A paper describes a structure:
Here, we show that repeat number variation in predicted bacterial surface proteins is more widespread and we characterize a third rod-like repetitive region in the Streptococcus gordonii protein (Sgo_0707) formed by tandem array of Streptococcal High Identity Repeats in Tandem (SHIRT) domains. The structure of single and tandem SHIRT domains from the streptococcal surface protein Sgo_0707 were determined. We call SasG, Rib, and Sgo_0707 “Periscope Proteins” due to their having variable-length stalk-like regions that define the distance that the N-terminal functional domain projects from the bacterial surface. Taken together, these data are consistent with multiple tandemly arrayed SHIRT domains from Sgo_0707 behaving as an elongated, rod-like particle.
Based on the significant truncation of the N-terminal β-strand (Inset), we hypothesized that shifting the frame of the repeat by seven residues toward the N terminus of Sgo_0707 would complete the fold. Sgo_R3 (residues 621 through 705) and Sgo_R10 (residues 1211 through 1299) based on this new definition were thus expressed and purified. The model confirms that SHIRT has an α/β fold organized around a single α-helix and two distinct β-sheets. We report the 3D structure of a SHIRT domain which, while also containing β-sheets, has a topology with no obvious relationship to the Ig fold.
Numbering used by the authors: 1214 to 1296
Write the structure that this text describes.
Amino acid sequence: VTHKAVHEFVSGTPGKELPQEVKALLPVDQTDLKDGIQVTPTQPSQTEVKTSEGTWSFKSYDKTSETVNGSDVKFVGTWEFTA
């Protein structure tokens, strides 16, 4: 069975939604995986996004890796906002 790894971004700053400029940095899925394969999340191409109101900074993903075992993988990446 082939599997994939996908990415999701969240805001780490309560009350503040991610803007399109940050969402657009979401990496593409990693494809063609099989059970037994280790995966590492793709880095966002930029880790800092400046806005009129402040800065979004990429903190980290929730995991540094996952080894595929029967399911597709999701890595959740957190951005923090400072005004």
